[PDB]
Design a protein around this nucleic acid. Structure first.
Ligand SMILES: [Mg+2]
Ligand SMILES: [Zn+2]
Lengths: 50, 1362, 298, 90, 49, 79
DNA sequence: ACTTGACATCCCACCTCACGTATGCTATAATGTGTGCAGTCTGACGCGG
DNA sequence: CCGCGTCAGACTCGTAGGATTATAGCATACGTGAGGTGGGATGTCAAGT
RNA sequence: GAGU
């Protein structure tokens, strides 16, 4: 239920029903999608030598 | 059928025949097309009664003319359908089956009667093996297991004399043949010659079962069921949904299977089927039966056609969705309505807005009666037709009924009794209920869509109780503390604050006014601001001693605003009260003082006034919330960047390596704490004042009018902390768990946080909200348990005449006098007079209730300790005395005889727990605790004087304390204990004993996050048993080769290093054990679990140099988290994990029989001849030196005290004292004030039972656990007549057990363990006399409390008269 | 089993009333307490009267300050609309309108999105103006939003106080409020929670099959459960007859409720209780378990 | 009173007594049509009973007094009737 | 939803605890008026009656 | 019972031929029985569904929490 | 105020009819199997061993 | 002391809608609920009582 | 999905 650092850019840490449902149900973050194996992923920009 | 009692016992099979009217031979219910009942089926009309009123099956005979007519063709009796709720049927079971409940439920009376374990019985029952019933042959007697061919090897050789069988029928047989009478006598004779301890305990238990069994008259053979009773059809009805579909109870499906299998058994018997399949069928029979009673108790249960487990009879009674709690102790009710609440500023205190359409519906029947009596409608049918159209007339009749009717408003949860209040309803348009603002605090209601229920007490009596006892205006004071609940909130306070607050010049400074009315006239003309400082001529009024009017007439200095407010103020209250800028503080005080001195009606009226005022002036004031209203303190980034740059310097200075993990963590966190508080106070200064604009050149200052700040200081909404997060720095928060993050949030909500910072805060947020949910159900459940225990306590007597009582102190727990004597004792009856050398040798007459004014007088005397007559020390049976209880806080007076004080206490104590969870869980979006327990600071100039310690002076020159029993007090001019501080082990001191401390000088000092162990003597550190891996962990670096040893506790230790107690031995320059000055100890300082040993082997320590620092991380729950279970545990009388041990009687104690480090004590009493030897753990720490002259209940061990032990040694008053204080400590942490008397109530309930040594004329004997009430009843009757005496000792039971122990089995059955309690009472043949509350509740009778006292005592006298 | 069926759609035009549920995006929520006539509400110096009056005391302890930001930016957004609407009423020239509008968009020293107008055709220009006549819609994106200073800057372009507070005249009395208050436009919503549905009450109706207690829900014309909690309240008071009402005449006692109904019409208000059906349910289920429970005579 | 029944409360002594004693008088008004002492001013029997006891003109003891009196008058007059039935009995 | 001119201020306890004060002008303009399309079904069954 | 058995064996085939469902008329055709009789059997075909059935998807209600007794003439009418 | 008799409409009971229901009988050989989810918690008092 | 077992875990209300099954057939004997027509029981009328 |  508790808030994991991994949720960053994948699930909104801040969208969930209050009460006993809390922690269980969470909305997908904006840019986020499922990878090949159904794992959560986030798009990121490359930075080459500075 | 107007009844006295309820008895429960085993149902006899032939008694079951008696109740049952007919045998259900067929599993069929009804015909598929014609849904009439089938012949001998489950819904049979011949057995259970006719489907439809006064009409038989075949339908020749109908009408009332036929009653008791018995249709010759069909065999249907002609009567009321209602009979199908009350006729039972029955089944003839072919194989006598055992009752599951008496097997699988613990302890299992069958098993305990036969002293036979479960498995044996199982294998027997399930036909896996045979067992010996009756052995003519000596080889084998009762209760021997035989296998398949062991039975054959037995039968072949013996037989004739040899009797054995298989299964439940065999067990039935063994049940009949066992000798009831003889065995009881046998056992006591066994006891007479020899009683090894545990053997005698079990033999005792068994004796109790047996005796109870034959007294109740329950026959053991009844354990085996021959006849199976069958539930009335209406209770398991069969109904069509309108779509053609059907619904049937789960009982029906279990029952059907029962019949199917039983009929197959009849077939198999007539066919003479082989043993294997006959046995299999008996298994199946047993299954079906036991599934029907309690499904799944037996292991894998029968499921629904769905998947869902079938719902058995047990589920029906027991479950929370069972009959008790859902349908019996509570239900759905008519004449109630429910809808959204809306504000009613215009409503009076005792009023409420009631929506048109709601009230129309509610008050339906009242309408009809008056419609017909006034003749507006010809009959009731026409009255209905006239209501359903709805003309002007209808509304008028409603008006007349609603006139002087009181209606009840309810909000869930029912936190306390004021969750329902009575009001005069006033009709309004719309569908919304209007609630009075004042009472929102009691309901804890707020306007964001909350709904309320509105019930109608219908009778004159209901109306009376609602208006008189439940009326809003009657109940202002919390039953919990004496103080008001119905009080100013938010806007109210704000308006008041606005008016009372004073301002530089503005308009009309220094005007002199002829009376108050002029003030308002001036404001309204705009010729003066309300903030303007003014001289007004006003007459303050005074109460006399007899109650007259005392007009005093002269000059007051106030604002315009305060003059207006003095208008509101009632005749006789001093000006002093309004003279100050009123906040939440001042407001409540006004009301309080007013109530206590003036009285009821005046206060009622005045409170309303104050409400309206506040609204008004809030409105003209025009207070709002703009972005600039939140002022970012001038020096924010300066103070922040400085703290940041310095922390950066210490991180760079990390790589250099004078930086352990502990020190760095400490350093970072402390610099951040100090920086935030700097920021806080600069933000507060800025916001707090800020009227420093130029007076044409130079500047000036006064109290500015910032709206947020005003809300803060007013106590209107904000507190300082919230402000801090808004305009200041948000601060540090808590990570996922206990972890506290190093870098804080420097920014504020004004600036806006970013990705990272906002993300950071979510952890705490989510954690908080999940707590508010899931952690509150614990508190609710706890409360219900309290409720159930505390029901029977009612005021029956005025005064039984007890002299006994509990000595209450002003609680000087460490740091200050957190709760004084006055606060703890107010409104209590005293027992005895206390003497103190005082202003003139104080004496105070006893049996006296101490009123407020009594208290004031005793305040001037300054008595410390007061014996007060307690609820516990009450002599009254089953309940308490008016005197022993004292004031009913809610009413202000002495409690009314008859009022149920038990539930009173419970509601008050459950209420806050439930609140103090929810609140800091949905408002405190992060986590921290005040743990800067750094320095002590003496406030006022006095002498330093120490009690209880022994220190040892070092090289640097600090007075370092090595005692666990240390306090540091403050003496004033002529010798008294004013101020008190609590200093832990290892704390450096400054001034020792005798010397004077000047104001605000640092007299004590210690580092918080680290308790050092400090040596008393000098020399070289010698290492004993600290090997690497076993008891310590090597942490070593390069550089010059420095390290820091960590001595690990039990968890990280391998299996070989379990008993190894790591030490640091004190040897000298020569080698030999240097001894601590004057004492015999070779100084061996036992470093505890995880003692991070900085000073390694080889560095000559000076006397008072640290050997090893002990870290204790107090993450800091606070809240009601750690609090809740601790409270619960004290109330459940649960011995804590490390209980300390005590001494039994008095006299010189000594050592003797010593194991390795297992201490032994042989206490031989100087008076008492006997020696008590008690063994002591090795790792257990002792507080005592050796030979002392001890008293009973002498604490020796370290830790929290086990409640039971305290009860046994000290006795009642001390244990009770400990409970009260220890509980109260938690709630004091939260600042929720509750009277000790409630806690006292509970404890008396927990003392309900005792243990008997020595026989009366009755059913006693050794070690029986009988009620305290039955002991005193025996006292009366036996002392007066003679007979042999009985010695008793009091016992302590916590909560659940105490509740289950009470002689009210329907009470206990309603609580928990429904199954178990029923069986015990059934075997006991117990008779419930029905004196308690919930009993009558469930029966729909008159509660024996209060209003129902009269009727209930009448039945009691009718018991005496035959 | 079903011969025929007809579906019918009702169209209700449901008007807002007191007790309906409304909120903003910031978690600030509330019930309508009273709808005031236009006269009652405070008004501007300009004569523009207010729409909604929200309690400032809902702010500080709940710690959502963003709603204040929305209010300020919201007034300035409409301030834009004000001035534009004025120049629309005043006709004027394309060019001048174009100037005002573009200088507005390019307001931020730090803006990303640069809408250099120029190329736009006269059609598109006057068209755009008409649309922004209703108050110009702005985009603060999450965390990457509009700083307070840029908001202050725009409040100058709205020709309104930079603090976003205005002195208000009380439409009832004519007295000014002594100090200015925060006014401006905020985006409100009416919830799916309609007081229309939340209203429900029951005197007499359908009862439960087994227990013979009143049913649940507006769907059955059900009554509220008076729970053990509520019981506890009554118990705290000495209120025995009210309690007994709830236990018997109001629920499972058939003879009792009917009799007391008739008594009420007749103006008696005597109770005369009976035996609640639930308790009989209890008895019979215990005897089904082969457990004998008898109620003993005196 | 109307607002706060506290004065009436104080006149009797106990809260609960007040409620029950008031109900018995209010019931009498309802049932017997017994005549309200203080001019009615359309109050409910709740309030009527409250007022009477407020002024102290009803007491539990005087309610029972009124019962004793009217019961004695009933027996005196129905001496004639119960005597005929009584002679019949033996 | 819709956007209104709000004024942050305490009223004579009509805005008490997050409660809302609102103008008749809202109804005048017909803002915040919901269309609810509610469904009902009439069923003609066959009993053996 | 045997008639019910026929019903369901045929049901499979017919669903596969049509690509959808069997209407009583079409079903009645293939069996050469009177439509009324078919419909009767279809209704009678419904098995006992449990009164204790958790109607509440959230364990709210045991179907019983719906059922009202229409036998009871209402206190209105009793008056 | 009432009865009598005539003539004409309505209510109760027993008989032949037809569908519905209860139970038997079948012959190549068929002979050791089904089956799942429950759980994770969590302090708790208790007996058993 | 580990073993495993047993028993607990808020308050009210509010909103959506219920079926998947695999299953042979029949020839015969017996019982159970019903339509279709005559005897007996009240209903309605017109004179004359 | 409401609120405490
Ligand atoms: Mg709320
Ligand atoms: Zn019959």
């Amino acid at each position: 239920r508790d808030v994991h650092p991994t949720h960053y850019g994948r699930v909104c840490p801040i969208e969930t029903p209050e009460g006993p449902n809390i922690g269980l149900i969470n909305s997908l973050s904006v840019y986020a999608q499922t990878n090949e194996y159904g794992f959560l992923e986030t798009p990121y920009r490359k930075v080459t030598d500075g | 059928e107007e009844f006295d009692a309820i008895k429960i016992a085993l149902a006899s099979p032939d008694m079951i025949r008696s109740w049952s009217f007919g045998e259900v031979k067929k599993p069929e219910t009804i015909n598929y097309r014609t849904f009439k009942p089938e012949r001998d089926g489950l819904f049979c009309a011949r057995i259970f009664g006719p489907v439809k009123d006064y009409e038989c099956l075949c339908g020749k005979y109908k009408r009332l003319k036929h009653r008791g007519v018995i249709c010759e063709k069909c065999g249907v009796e002609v009567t009321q359908t209602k009979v199908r709720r009350e006729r039972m049927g029955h089944i003839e079971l072919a194989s006598p089956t055992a009752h599951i409940w008496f097997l699988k439920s613990l302890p299992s009376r069958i098993g305990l009667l036969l002293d036979m374990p479960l498995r044996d019985i199982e294998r027997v029952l399930y036909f896996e093996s045979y067992v010996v019933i009756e052995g003519g042959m000596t080889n084998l007697e009762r209760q021997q297991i035989l296998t398949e061919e062991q039975y054959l090897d037995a039968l072949e050789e013996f037989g004739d004399e040899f009797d054995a069988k298989m299964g439940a029928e065999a067990i039935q047989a063994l049940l009949k043949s066992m000798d009831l009478e003889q065995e009881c006598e046998q056992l006591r004779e066994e006891l007479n010659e020899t009683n090894s301890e545990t053997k005698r305990k079990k033999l005792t238990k068994r004796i109790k079962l047996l005796e109870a069994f034959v007294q109740s008259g329950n026959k053991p053979e009844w354990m085996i069921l021959t006849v199976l009773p069958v539930l009335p059809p209406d209770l398991r009805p069969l109904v069509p949904l309108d779509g053609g579909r059907f619904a049937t109870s789960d009982l029906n499906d279990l029952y059907r299977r029962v019949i199917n299998r039983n009929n197959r058994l009849k077939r198999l018997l007539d066919l003479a089927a082989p043993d294997i399949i006959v046995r299999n069928e008996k298994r199946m029979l047993q299954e079906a039966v036991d599934a029907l009673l309690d499904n799944g108790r037996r292991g894998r249960a029968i499921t629904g056609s769905n998947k869902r487990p079938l719902k058995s009879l047990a589920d029906m009674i027991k479950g929370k969705q069972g009959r008790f709690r859902q349908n019996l102790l509570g239900k759905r009710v008519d004449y109630s309505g429910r809808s959204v609440i809306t504000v009613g500023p215009y409503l009076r205190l005792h009023q409420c807005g009631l929506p048109k359409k709601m009230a129309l519906e509610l008050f339906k029947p009242f309408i009809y009666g008056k419609l017909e009596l006034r003749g507006l409608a010809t009959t009731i049918k026409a009255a209905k037709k006239m209501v359903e159209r709805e003309e002007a007339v209808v509304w008028d009749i409603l008006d007349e009924v609603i006139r002087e009717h009181p209606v009840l408003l309810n909000r869930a949860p029912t936190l306390h009794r004021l969750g329902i209040q009575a009001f005069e309803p006033v009709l309004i348009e719309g569908k919304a209920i209007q609630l009075h603002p004042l009472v929102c605090a009691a309901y804890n209601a707020d306007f964001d869509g909350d709904q309320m229920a509105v019930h109608v007490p219908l009778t004159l009596e209901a109306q009376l109780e609602a208006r008189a006892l439940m009326m809003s205006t009657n109940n202002i004071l919390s039953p919990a503390n004496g103080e008001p609940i119905i009080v100013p909130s938010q806007d109210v306070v704000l308006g008041l604050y606005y008016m009372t607050r004073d301002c530089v010049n503005a308009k009309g400074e220094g005007m002199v006014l002829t009376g108050p009315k002029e003030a308002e006239r001036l404001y309204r003309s705009g010729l003066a601001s309300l903030h303007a400082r003014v001289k007004v001529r006003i007459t303050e009024y005074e109460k006399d001693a007899n109650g007259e009017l005392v007009a005093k007439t002269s000059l007051k200095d106030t604002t315009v605003g305060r003059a207006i407010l003095w208008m509101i103020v009632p005749k006789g209250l001093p000006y002093s009260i309004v003279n100050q800028a009123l906040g939440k503080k001042a407001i409540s005080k006004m009301l309080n003082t007013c109530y206590r001195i003036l009285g009821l009606k005046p206060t009622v009226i005045f409170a309303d006034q104050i409400m309206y005022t506040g609204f008004a002036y809030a409105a003209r004031s025009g207070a709002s919330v703009g972005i600039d209203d939140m002022v970012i303190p001038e020096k924010k980034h300066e103070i922040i960047s400085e703290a940041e740059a310095e922390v950066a310097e210490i991180q760079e200075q990390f790589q250099s390596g004078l930086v352990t993990a502990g020190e760095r963590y400490n350093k970072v966190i402390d610099i951040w704490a100090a920086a935030n508080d700097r920021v806080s106070k600069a933000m507060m200064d800025n916001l707090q004042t800020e009227t420093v604009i130029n007076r044409d050149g130079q500047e000036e200052k006064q109290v500015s009018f910032n709206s947020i700040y005003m809300m803060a200081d007013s106590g209107a909404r904000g507190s300082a902390a919230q402000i801090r997060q808004l305009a200041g720095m948000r601060g540090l928060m808590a990570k996922p768990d206990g972890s506290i993050i190093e870098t804080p949030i420097t920014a504020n909500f004004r600036e806006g946080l970013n990705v990272l910072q906002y993300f950071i805060s979510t952890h705490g947020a989510r954690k908080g909200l999940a707590d508010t949910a899931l952690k509150t159900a614990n508190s609710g459940y706890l409360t219900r348990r309290l409720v159930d225990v505390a029901q029977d306590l009612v005021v029956t007597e005025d005064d039984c005449g007890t002299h006994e009582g509990i000595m209450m102190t002003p609680v000087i727990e460490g740091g200050d006098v957190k709760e004084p004597l006055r606060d703890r004792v107010l409104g209590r009856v005293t027992a005895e007079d206390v003497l103190k050398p005082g202003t003139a040798d104080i004496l105070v007459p006893r049996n006296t209730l101490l009123h407020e004014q009594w208290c004031d007088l005793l305040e001037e005397n300054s008595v410390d300790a007061v014996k007060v007559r307690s609820v516990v020390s009450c002599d009254t049976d089953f309940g308490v005395c008016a005197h022993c209880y004292g004031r009913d806080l809610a009413r202000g007076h002495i409690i009314n005889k008859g009022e149920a004080i038990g539930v009173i206490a419970a509601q008050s104590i459950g209420e806050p727990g439930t609140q103090l969870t929810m609140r800091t869980f949905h408002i405190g979006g992060a986590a921290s605790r005040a743990a800067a327990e750094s320095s002590i600071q003496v406030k006022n100039k006095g002498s330093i004087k120490l009690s209880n310690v022994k220190s040892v002076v070092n090289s640097s020159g600090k007075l370092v304390i090595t005692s666990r029993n240390t306090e540091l007090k403050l003496i004033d001019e002529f010798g008294r204990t004013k101020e008190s501080y609590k200093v832990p082990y290892g704390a450096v001191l400054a001034k020792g004993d005798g010397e004077q401390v000047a104001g605000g000088e640092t007299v004590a000092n210690w580092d918080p996050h680290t308790m050092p162990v400090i040596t008393e003597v000098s020399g070289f550190v010698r290492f004993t048993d600290m090997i690497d891996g076993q008891t310590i962990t090597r942490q070593t670096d390069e550089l010059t080769g420095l390290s820091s040893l960590v001595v690990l506790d039990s968890a990280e230790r391998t299996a070989g290093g379990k008993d190894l107690r790591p030490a640091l031995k004190i040897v000298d320059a020569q080698g030999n054990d240097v001894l601590i000055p004057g004492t015999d100890m070779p100084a061996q300082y036992f470093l505890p679990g995880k003692a991070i040993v900085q000073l390694e082997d080889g560095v000559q320590i000076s006397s008072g140099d640290t050997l090893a620092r002990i870290p204790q991380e107090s993450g800091g729950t606070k809240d009601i988290t750690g609090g809740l279970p601790r409270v619960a545990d004290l109330f459940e009388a649960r011995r804590p994990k490390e209980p300390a041990i005590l001494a039994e009687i008095s006299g010189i104690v000594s050592f003797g029989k010593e194991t390795k480090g297992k201490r032994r004590l042989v206490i031989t009493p100087v008076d008492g001849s006997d020696p008590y030897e008690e063994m002591i753990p090795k790792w257990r720490q002792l507080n005592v030196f050796e030979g002392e002259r001890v008293e009973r209940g002498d604490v020796i061990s370290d830790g929290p005290e086990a409640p039971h032990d305290i009860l046994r040694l000290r006795g009642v008053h001390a244990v009770t004292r400990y409970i009260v204080n220890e509980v109260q400590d938690v709630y004091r942490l939260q600042g929720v004030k509750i009277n000790d008397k409630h806690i006292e109530v509970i404890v008396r309930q927990m003392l309900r039972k005792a243990t008997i040594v020595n026989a009366g004329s009755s059913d006693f004997l050794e070690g029986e656990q009988v009620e305290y009430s039955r002991v005193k009843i025996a006292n009366r009757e036996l002392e007066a007549n003679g007979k042999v005496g009985a010695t008793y000792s009091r016992d302590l039971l916590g909560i659940t057990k105490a509740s289950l122990a009470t002689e009210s089995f329907i009470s206990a059955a309603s609580f928990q363990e429904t199954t178990r309690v029923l069986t015990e009472a059934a075997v006991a043949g117990k008779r419930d006399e029905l004196r308690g509350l919930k009993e009558n509740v469930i029966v729909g009778r008159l509660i024996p409390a209060g209003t129902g006292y009269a009727y209930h005592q009448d039945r009691m006298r009718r018991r005496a008269a035959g | 089993g079903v011969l025929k069926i007809v579906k019918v759609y009702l169209a209700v035009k449901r008007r807002i009333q007191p007790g309906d549920k409304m909120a903003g995006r910031h978690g600030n929520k509330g019930v309508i307490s009273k709808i005031n006539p236009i006269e009652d509400m405070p008004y501007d110096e300009n004569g523009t009267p207010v729409d909604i009056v929200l309690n400032p005391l809902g702010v500080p302890s709940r710690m959502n300050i963003g709603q204040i930001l929305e209010t300020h930016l919201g007034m300035a957004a409409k301030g834009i609309g004000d001035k534009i609407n004025a120049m629309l009423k005043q006709q004027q020239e394309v060019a001048k309108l174009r100037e005002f509008i573009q200088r507005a968009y390019d307001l931020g020293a730090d803006v990303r999105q640069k809408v250099d107008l120029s190329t736009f055709s006269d059609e598109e220009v006057m068209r755009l103006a008409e649309n922004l006549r209703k108050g110009m819609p702005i985009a603060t994106p999450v965390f990457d939003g509009a700083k307070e200073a840029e908001i202050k800057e725009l409040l100058k372009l709205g020709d309104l106080p930079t603090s976003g507070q205005i002195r208000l005249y009380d439409g009832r009395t004519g007295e000014q409020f002594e100090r200015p208050v925060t006014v401006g436009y905020m985006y409100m919503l009416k919830l799916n929670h309609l007081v229309d549905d939340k209203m429900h009450a029951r005197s007499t109706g359908s009862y439960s099959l087994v227990t013979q207690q009143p049913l649940g829900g507006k769907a059955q014309f059900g009554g509220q459960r008076f729970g053990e909690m509520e019981v506890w309240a009554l118990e705290a008071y000495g209120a025995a007859y009210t309690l007994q009402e709830m236990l018997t005449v109001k629920s499972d006692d058939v003879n009792g409720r009917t009799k007391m109904y008739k008594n009420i019409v007749d103006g008696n208000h005597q109770m005369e209780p009976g035996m609640p059906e639930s308790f009989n349910v209890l008895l019979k289920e215990i005897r089904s378990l082969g457990i004998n429970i008898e109620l003993e005579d005196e | 009173a109307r607002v706060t029944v506290q004065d009436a409360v104080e006149k009797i002594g106990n809260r609960f007594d007040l409620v029950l004693v008031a109900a018995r008088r209010a019931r009498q008004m309802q049932v017997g049509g017994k005549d309200p002492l203080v001019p009615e001013e359309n109050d409910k029997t709740t309030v009527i009973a409250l007022r009477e006891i407020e002024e102290g003109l009803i007491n539990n003891q005087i309610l029972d007094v009124r019962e004793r009196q009217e019961q004695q008058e009933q027996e005196a007059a129905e001496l004639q009737a119960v005597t005929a039935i009584a002679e019949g009995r033996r | 939803g819709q956007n209104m001119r709000v004024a942050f201020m305490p009223w004579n306890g009509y805005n008490f605890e997050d409660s809302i004060l609102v103008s008749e002008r809202v109804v005048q303009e017909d803002r915040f008026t919901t269309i609810h399309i509610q469904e009902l079904a009439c069923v003609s069954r066959d009993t053996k009656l | 019972i045997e008639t019910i058995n026929k019903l369901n064996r045929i049901s499979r085939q017919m669903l596969q031929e049509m690509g959808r469902e069997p209407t009583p008329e079409e079903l009645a055709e293939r069996m050469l029985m009177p439509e009324d009789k078919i419909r009767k059997v279809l209704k009678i075909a419904k098995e006992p569904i449990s009164m204790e059935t958790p109607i509440g998807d959230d364990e709210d209600s045991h179907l019983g929490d719906f059922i009202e007794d229409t036998t009871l003439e209402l206190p209105l009418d009793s008056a």
